Amino acid sequence: SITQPMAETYNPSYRPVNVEQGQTATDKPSFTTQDDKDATAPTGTTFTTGTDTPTWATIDPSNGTVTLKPGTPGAYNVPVTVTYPDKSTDETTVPVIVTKA
Ligand code: NA
């Protein structure tokens, strides 16, 4: 705590994703610094979905890539917890718009 948490330094986000009902899509996270400079998250950062996730969103905890296999049309924020190697955490979202075929 003379050093600062990694969660202060890094800012995760996901791309907005449309996915058609009955189709598959993917989304992956990107990071910025506190100036919206592109950043490489610390090596060993992990990713999990929160408990309120839609059941058709699966995550690869090694890199945060999210596979989406909906599901009822609508708008959904998939909750993702980013755990940095220093055990600090960010919360972010996978913003998904599911459209009808
Ligand atoms: Na952060």
Side-chain angles (χ1 to χ4, degrees), residues 1-3 5-33 35-101:
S1 78
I2 201 189
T3 57
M6 289 157 178
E8 182 180 344
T9 292
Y10 290 91
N11 306 102
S13 63
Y14 287 80
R15 199 179 170 72
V17 59
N18 166 60
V19 51
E20 182 171 297
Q21 178 172 35
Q23 301 194 336
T24 300
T26 55
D27 204 339
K28 48 185 179 173
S30 297
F31 291 78
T32 63
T33 70
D35 351 3
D36 208 43
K37 295 302 206 278
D38 300 325
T40 316
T43 312
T45 296
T46 69
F47 301 79
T48 190
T49 50
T51 57
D52 195 35
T53 185
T55 56
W56 41 258
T58 59
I59 195 160
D60 182 340
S62 72
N63 67 13
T65 300
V66 167
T67 304
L68 311 161
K69 297 180 173 278
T72 301
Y76 303 88
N77 275 335
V78 176
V80 172
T81 303
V82 178
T83 300
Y84 300 101
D86 64 2
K87 307 317 308 197
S88 68
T89 57
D90 273 314
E91 283 297 315
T92 194
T93 62
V94 189
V96 185
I97 304 276
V98 178
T99 53
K100 183 166 179 157

